[PDB]
Design a protein around this ligand. Sequence first.
Ligand code: UDP
Ligand code: MN
Length: 535
Amino acid sequence: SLISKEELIKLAYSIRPRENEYKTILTNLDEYNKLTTNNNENKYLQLKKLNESIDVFMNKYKTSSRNRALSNLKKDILKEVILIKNSNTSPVEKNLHFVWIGGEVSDIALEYIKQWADINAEYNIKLWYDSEAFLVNTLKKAIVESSTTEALQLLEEEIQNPQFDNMKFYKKRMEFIYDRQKRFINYYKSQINKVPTIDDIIKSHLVSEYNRDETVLESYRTNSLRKINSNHGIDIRANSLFTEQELLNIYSQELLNRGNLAAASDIVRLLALKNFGGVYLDVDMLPGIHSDLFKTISRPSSIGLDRWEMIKLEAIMKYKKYINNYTSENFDKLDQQLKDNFKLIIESKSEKSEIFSKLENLNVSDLEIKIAFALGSVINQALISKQGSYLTNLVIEQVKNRYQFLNQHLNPAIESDNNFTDTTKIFHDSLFNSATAENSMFLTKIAPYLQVGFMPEARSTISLSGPGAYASAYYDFINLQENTIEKTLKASDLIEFKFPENNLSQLTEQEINSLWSFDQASAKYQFEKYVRDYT
Ligand SMILES: O=c1ccn([C@@H]2O[C@H](COP(=O)(O)OP(=O)(O)O)[C@@H](O)[C@H]2O)c(=O)[nH]1
Ligand SMILES: [Mn+2]
């Protein structure tokens, strides 16, 4: 066990009589050692309480002779965390969570989900949706289309100049995008004083402001609702996932104010795991390839490890056709002897499960959450966690704490009723006065929050509901803290939380398509398409 109260008394000497903060430490040390409980969260919390009481002392008495022995004890506490999390492991609840909010779910997403279904016939599959918001994506399309045209009519004479910089286009368009969102939101607020749905209001707004037939829009709603209930769909609003008002407001400011489905989705995946436990997966993930499968086929030295994994999938698809119209462009580049060898291997396999791994058992700790990796960094596109896991609750806290930081400076900025430019200067001015050595990177990364999705290089979502929130919660757990903004674990500490590598295929056609590339070059590119399609 941890060292005893009676030997800390020996090692933590001082000429001074026992300070009360040191007495409390002794009491926490005895409480912990003398625990009978086998409840890991209980054990962990008692560890956390002890470690908190050590830090108070060492901060109050920075020169006590007791600090060496209390420092060595903190080192032993850090080791105890790992002992606790490795002490009662078991498999996870056999649920798969997928999420599709915002519009009609694609046939192609349904095809990828069906792969998971077939291989893992004993998992209960849930496809989360929001019955209130099938028209959000449609609305955001219309606003961006109208704004593009507005910006081009305004910039038309300056665009003739060959040294014109497309960034000025993107700033201009975003002003227009902001005003259109604002009008919609104020219209929304005005209609909810009595009890209408988001779709009712989007529908009315589209007919009034964007020349839409209510009957076309209604058919899209009913059809998209039908198609998702026929495919494992389950409505977030009927199962009361949001019990906390704080979290519902976060999901609504993403779903409604910004119209950011990715971010609104990040909230939902965590609540799903918290309430039901199991495995979350983005709809562009595929099951893992059997490990042996292509061991007799050596990767050419000209082809990166990544393309090689992309190729193995294309091979299975070209010969098994699990998914219709799956790209072949990379498999085609191979020398005929490779192609043949792939065809021999694949076409000699009888059943789908001889090709793809099944999850089967996923034996993990009830304290933890496991997560996919990319380039040695975490990425929230696959998740494993037991129902009500502590680390799952920590990630929620991080997200709450991060949005609370954000709205502190943003809400006063928006309530002031200004245009996008004045709103931004007000927002930033406030934001950068909060700056410390602790948070300055986080601050400059959520500074372009309002333009995420509409302008190149806005990636605030990463630091709010995405990986940034996860990386910090992993730090908080290992180091028995709360609410860390920026601090990170070394690679070897991080690795324990990896999603089992062979149980996932992360390099899919859709993953690659749906992957962020709104950099300065694709903005150049996209701008020319706009100028080309102008009238
Ligand atoms: O219109 C959308 C697009 C995104 N998503 C959710 O966000 C996840 C990830 O989106 P995407 O793959 O496009 O983003 P990426 O991870 O590549 O940045 C999807 O699996 C969906 O659950 C959604 O619900 N509606
Ligand atoms: Mn993706």
